[PDB]
Design a protein around this ligand. Structure first.
Ligand SMILES: [Ca+2]
Ligand SMILES: [Ca+2]
Lengths: 147, 146
């Protein structure tokens, strides 16, 4: 086949938390969260928490955003995989391309988006476990792929 | 870390290389491009299509996606299909199908998981069953293991 290149650094958490910002100190790379490889990301339950990474993107370009995720118990809300950035318009409109997960079995989802001609800020890929239940969230194999 | 597209010449950037043209009704042309320099045009006036064999892995999750548009109002549809037999007693047959009838560039996708054993080599079919004068443009057909 033909490779489609993934822009995400340490996308399977195989290098632990390398390259991922940890915003609430609620992240750990652990084998119980692995979908592939030896590790996955666990975001601990009880409060909204997550992390992310800044990823410069090309203008006028289509990307696939995808991930595998599961909660270890039924959540009240969701785990969201997001690409977010400001536009370079009068208001600096903030735009988010969002995948929502609430499943308790490993589930893959993806969306596609096309970037604007100019960016108002550097795109960020955020992994945001907004659910506040005691459910733990596992996520692994994150993709941000051109084409 | 990377996706591998199982579709050969998925953006038609190498013309009709690696694609079968079943009704001699296909061309790779600039007006049919959604991305890059070329896209596939399936000519109107009769049902027609093309495809290729695709060597999928068993017990594996795949995403099928494509962009398409008719260049004029169609009567029927354009279908993108992954199809194969299972390896059970009677080689059961499944088709994973995206249907298009839009006149603006439109992206559609689906997810499927492959069986433990295949009864036949999977096929990717691009089938423009529409019989109107409308030409069909398709580009960036991909099939990725995730
Ligand atoms: Ca992993
Ligand atoms: Ca193309």
């Amino acid at each position: 086949g033909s490779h489609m290149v993934n822009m995400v650094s340490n996308p399977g958490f195989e290098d632990g938390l390398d390259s991922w910002q940890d915003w609430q100190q609620d992240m750990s790379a652990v084998p119980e969260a692995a979908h592939n490889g030896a590790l996955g990301l666990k975001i601990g339950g009880g409060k909204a928490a997550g992390g992310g990474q800044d990823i410069p993107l090309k203008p006028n370009t289509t990307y696939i955003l995808g991930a595998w995720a599961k909660f270890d118990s039924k959540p009240a809300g969701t785990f969201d995989v997001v690409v977010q950035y400001h536009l370079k318009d009068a208001n600096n409109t903030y735009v988010q391309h969002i995948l929502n997960f609430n499943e308790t079995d490993w589930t893959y989802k993806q969306l596609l988006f096309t970037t604007p001609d100019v960016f108002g800020s550097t795109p960020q890929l955020a992994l945001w476990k907004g659910d506040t239940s005691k459910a733990n969230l596992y996520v692994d194999d994150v993709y941000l792929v051109e084409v």
